[PDB]
């Protein structure tokens, strides 16, 4: 027997894209990457991670790098390289690149 369907933690990519209006500035991308980083490290919330520091200061490694890239690409549906963490050291850089 197949298991029951997994309940989505949040809205799907289509619902977000509806909410991620092009009018909206580099803010939705910022908060989503902040949430992804917070959940990657097991932070208590997206507020604990701050965009002032870089991912290196947050304690990110290649282990966390590839899996965060996966959880970001699947959320956004767009293929990504495994190395923007060093190309873009700041969460604003990630937001503008996305």
């Amino acid at each position: 027997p197949l298991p029951r369907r997994a309940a989505a933690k949040t809205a799907s990519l289509t619902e977000r894209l509806a909410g991620l209006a092009e009018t909206e500035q580099a803010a939705a991308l910022l908060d989503l990457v902040r949430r992804h980083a917070a959940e990657v490290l097991g932070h208590s919330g997206a507020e604990s991670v701050h965009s002032g520091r870089t991912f290196k200061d947050a304690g990110f490694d290649s282990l966390t790098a590839v899996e965060l890239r996966n959880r970001l690409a699947a959320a956004t549906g767009l293929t990504l390289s495994p190395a923007m963490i060093f190309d873009y050291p700041k969460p604003p850089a990630l937001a503008d690149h996305l």
Partner: protein
């Protein structure tokens, strides 16, 4: 261990479809059970999980009789039983947890419905999230999420105990949206898709479950082999009365001979033989391994009994039996105490009498009490009971005196007939066998045994719902320095047995030493406490004591209400430690 935490181990009955899920639930294992109180959502989730294995995911009906309180130390054994599929492939569902099995929920389980109707929204959808909702993947719906979601309709104060038409569509939810319906509710994922549906949910006010009555034990007489012996180290003597037995014991204690004494009495259920047995038991508690109690139809097996090794033996037709304390499942179908009736309490001016009166008024709603004692003066207790709604008459009476007891009983108005007599009267005159005298034995026995005889004989014609004799464990387990008290308690139990055999109600409780916090074990010495802990005895709180009193009233007969450390005594038996002969059945 790959089983679901709320499901544990799943067992299928060979040749049957009945399924048993056995789990150990502890606050360490279940942090979401606040104080150990398991939310009903956890039971719903576990039922759904097991019904998934049974092929029936839709809860046709679930009614929770009572929630589950996890113990502070240890884990409660929880068994969920799935019955055979009946009509519509529905299966009976039961929940038990434990001490005697305690049923918590029951109902029927149904397969998946082909049509999933969408009931109209009867309220505003609200987003429910739980901080600390860890390992939500291990559940289809986490219990701490479902209970919070359903409290938005049932209410925080009301425990949701009724569930109908429960259907699940999603797994591993962390946040939900709650859209209540006319009867049930709908939980949807943040993505908007439906997750869970409840056709109807109903809540009930929380009721504090009574203290578990697992301390009640009866004196059972299991059979034992009689060894083929002809000569043994014994001193034969025919004990006739309590005074004669005490005199013979004193003479033997003055006798420097290191030869065991075989006390041969009549049938132990006889009140005189009961007093003899109690005195010999107390002496043995003082002098272990040196005195033997015998109740033999044929005393020719007396050396064999001496070779048996059990101090207390009753032989009939060549087959021997020994006294043991065995737990009894409390009874459900008890005759209710009539609120219009009158309950007479002996020794009500004491702490225990006031406690019993308060418990009766608070629980059984006894609106009329007659508390009698030697002093019969308690304005504070009278006001306490009257403020609770009890009409209380307090009397200075000798319960063992015929004229005063009859005057008290006749002082009860005819329009409020007597329905319960609790004999809590008792004088504690502690004494060792070497020093006790028949005068002290009579002084101990009169307020208990003569008083119980007078009460039962006077109330032979009265429609009594309960007749309680406040005995003590000292007459059964034996207690050094309480030989007269032990004889009084044993004869009180014998009187209760005779009264029950006389087609009249009689319940005698041989309670163990109470809790020190209750304030009624102040006269207990440190040696008494050390011996109690050695034999596994532990203090009895007032609440559990009165609950056990009610359970014994429901059960009747003679019962021993005492708390023992189970695992400690089992380890003592495994270590070859000093398990008392009466506790040999226990260990």
């Amino acid at each position: 261990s790959a089983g679901d935490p709320l499901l544990g181990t799943v067992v299928s009955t060979p040749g049957s479809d009945r399924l048993t899920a056995v789990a150990q639930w502890s606050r360490r294992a279940q942090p979401w059970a606040v104080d150990g109180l398991v939310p009903n959502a956890a039971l719903v989730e576990a039922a759904i999980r097991l019904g998934d294995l049974a092929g029936t995911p839709v809860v046709g009906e679930l009614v929770v009789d009572a929630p589950v309180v996890l113990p502070r130390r240890g884990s409660r054994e929880v068994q969920l039983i799935v019955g055979e599929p009946g009509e519509q492939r529905r299966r009976p569902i039961e929940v038990f947890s434990r001490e005697p099995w305690t049923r918590h929920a029951h109902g029927t389980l149904a397969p998946a419905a082909a049509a999933v109707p969408e009931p109209a929204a009867a309220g505003d959808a609200t987003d429910v999230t739980v901080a600390g909702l860890r390992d939500a993947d291990r559940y289809g719906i986490h219990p701490a999420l479902l209970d919070a979601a359903v409290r938005t309709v049932v209410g925080d104060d009301l425990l949701p105990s009724v569930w109908t038409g429960v259907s699940l569509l999603a797994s591993g939810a962390t946040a939900v949206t709650v859209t209540p319906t006319a009867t049930g509710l709908r939980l949807t994922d943040p993505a908007g898709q439906p997750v869970l549906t409840v056709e109807s949910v109903r809540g009930t006010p929380f009721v504090a479950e009574q203290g578990t009555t697992d301390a009640l034990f009866r004196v059972d007489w299991p059979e034992i082999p009689l060894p083929t012996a002809e000569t043994a180290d014994f001193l034969p003597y025919e004990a006739t009365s309590a005074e004669a037995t005490l005199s013979a014991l004193q003479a033997w204690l003055a006798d420097p001979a290191e030869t065991r004494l075989a006390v041969v009495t009549g049938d132990c259920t006889e009140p005189g033989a009961a007093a003899i047995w109690g005195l010999v038991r107390s002496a043995q508690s003082e002098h272990p391994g040196r005195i033997v109690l015998a109740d033999l139809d044929d005393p020719a097996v007396l050396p064999a009994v001496v070779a048996s090794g059990e101090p207390q033996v009753r032989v009939r037709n060549g087959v021997a039996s020994v006294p043991r304390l065995t737990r009894v499942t409390p009874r459900q179908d008890a005759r209710p105490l009539d609120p219009e009736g009158t309950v007479l309490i002996t020794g009500g001016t004491g702490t225990l009498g006031a406690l019993t009166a308060r418990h009766l008024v608070t629980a059984h709603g006894v609106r009329h009490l007659v508390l009698v004692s030697r002093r019969g003066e308690a304005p504070e207790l009278q006001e306490e009971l009257t403020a609770l709604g009890a009409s209380v008459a307090i009397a200075a009476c000798d319960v063992a005196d015929r004229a005063q007891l009859e005057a008290v009983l006749r002082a009860i108005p005819a329009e409020h007939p007597l329905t319960a007599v609790i004999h809590t009267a008792g004088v504690l005159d502690d004494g060792v066998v070497t020093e006790l005298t028949p005068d002290r034995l009579a002084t101990v026995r009169r307020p208990k045994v003569d008083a119980a005889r007078l009460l039962d004989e006077l109330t032979r014609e009265a429609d009594l719902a309960a007749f309680v004799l406040f005995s003590s464990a000292a007459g059964v387990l034996g207690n050094p320095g309480q030989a007269g008290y032990a004889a009084a308690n044993a004869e009180l139990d014998a009187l209760a047995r005779q009264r029950n055999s006389l087609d009249l109600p009689a319940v005698s409780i041989a309670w163990g030493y109470w809790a020190t916090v209750s304030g009624m074990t102040e006269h207990l010495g440190d040696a008494d406490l050390r011996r109690n802990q050695r034999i596994g005895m532990s203090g009895l709180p007032a609440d559990e004591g009165m609950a056990l009193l009610d359970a014994a009233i429901a059960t009747g007969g003679t019962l021993v209400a005492a708390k023992f450390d189970v695992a400690a005594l089992r380890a003592t038996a495994k270590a070859g430690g000093p398990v008392p002969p009466l506790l040999r059945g226990l260990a």
